[PDB]
């Protein structure tokens, strides 16, 4: 315990110059799948104790252990801030966990998600069946392509909300960070329609939550809030999210009109409406930046 | 010299079995055993200087106001006008510090049983030491379950519990028999707010401290959470009880505070700390 010689083995260590002098390690099990597609490096393993988990260019993407925190945030923050959402675009594959999230919504009648890497749909569909049933719900429509594009296909004012479930600004997803995709994403919602996207950690990321909240500030005339959340696997454990709407009827993201939990899937595990509302108070080194 | 990455600290327990945050090392400042525990201090690459006892994080410069904030905010702008509190548990006296932002305080006791802690905290983080300065600190080298034990009975508005894991000096800390303790050293409508541990990881743990407290405690007893990224699964919880006496509302401060400004704690984040998962909110409120 004195000099950091000895390396114990068995474990994979999540480091990258996004989070520099850190890391999480998780202890591995077994190896399932190792391999490297057209965009990314694609790991799924059984983790000792997080369940199994997807790795994508050496990032932890998700485990089953905490996945529910990111995965009911992410959805429900937007969807129960709407009445009666009826069609959802998700940008940004994986298990499938946000698809079962999205189909708890009675009214919705179209869930689109768009992924590039058919290579990590497949591996998550065999590796996490008891969630990627999610992608079989026949309202569900899977296109393999870029989000950036699939929008220019998209007829504006279509959407009532777009969920941004990104990889990090390095690789694939650094696109989805930019101001072009925000305006995209506008153009699709219909008026009052919203927007959540993977927004990064206030205690690793300012400088780049600070020009996100500008770019979207900028774009988006109705709401533009920012709400955070615990998961134990994202890089300092904590994971945020931008909630925007776009000028039309008006939207209180921090007190939702219909909050899933208070009414086929498990009860939920993480959100409430309290908690729902409690995303948005941010520590005072950050509410201070972000307002 | 285990680590799980060449020439890093990795943070390894059986009380959070299979995970491991590590944190690139600059030097190590120093290394010694007490006669409770092992210390190091080290200076990080990223988090400023780390506090580490029996191989676990107790702080860093960079995330430790996300903890002193709130285990000394929670409790004390709860209570209406606090005088008299206890800090069970030394450290780098940030806890001192944040309590001392409190103007109506006359008087803070601290019992931590190791002065090597003390010493160790006094000598490689001076910059926050300087809370042990306040006129107002009286601190006790000693067993900190003893000190509870020799109290006057109803003397105390708050006490503090900020203290290492149950895994070493701080094991009876967790336990009922401590609590009773706190419980008889409080005035009526006296709080008490204790390193509580992880709902991700310790539910069983932290299921049991639950029930003790709603055994002893007949005012309010509730359990808070925030942030700290280098404590292990990225939060850390507290227990707030307060006794039989004025009514205490832990989710709305009565007593909200205003030398540098909070970096963490504000009125909006001091209700947002109750609102627990799903998960958690129905084992800890069954």
């Not at 089953?64 to 940008?91: F, G, W």
């Not at 768009?114 to 899977?142: H, T, W």
């Not at 009532?160 to 997803?173: C, K, L, Q, R, T």
């Amino acid at each position: 315990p004195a000099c950091f010689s000895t390396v114990i083995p068995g474990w994979f260590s999540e480091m990258s110059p996004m989070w520099p002098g850190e890391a999480h390690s998780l202890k591995v099990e077994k190896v399932l799948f190792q391999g490297k597609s057209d965009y990314q490096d694609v790991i799924v393993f059984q983790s000792a104790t997080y369940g199994k988990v997807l790795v994508l260019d050496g990032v932890i993407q998700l485990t089953e252990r905490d996945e529910c925190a990111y995965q009911e945030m992410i959805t429900h923050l937007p969807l129960c801030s709407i009445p009666n959402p009826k069609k959802v675009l998700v940008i940004g594959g994986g298990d499938g966990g946000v698809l079962r999230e999205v189909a708890r919504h009675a009214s919705i009648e179209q869930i689109d998600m768009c992924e590039i890497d058919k290579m990590v749909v497949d591996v998550s569909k065999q590796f996490f069946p008891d969630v990627a049933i999610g992608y079989e719900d026949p309202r569900v429509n899977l296109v393999i392509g870029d989000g950036v594009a699939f929008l220019k296909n998209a007829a504006e004012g279509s959407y009532d909300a777009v969920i941004v479930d990104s990889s990090d600004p390095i690789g694939p997803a650094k696109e989805l960070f930019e101001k072009p995709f925000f305006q995209s994403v506008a153009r699709a919602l219909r008026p009052g329609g919203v927007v959540c996207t993977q927004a990064e950690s206030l205690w690793l990321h300012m400088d780049i939550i600070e020009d996100i909240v500008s770019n979207c500030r900028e774009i988006f005339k109705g709401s533009v809030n920012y709400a955070w959340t615990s998961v134990p696997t994202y890089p300092s454990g904590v994971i945020g999210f931008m909630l925007c709407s776009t000028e039309g009827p008006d939207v209180d993201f921090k007190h939702p009109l219909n909050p899933i939990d208070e009414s086929s899937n498990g009860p939920l595990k993480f959100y409430n409406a309290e908690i729902h509302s409690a995303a948005f108070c941010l520590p005072s080194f950050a509410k201070k930046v972000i307002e």
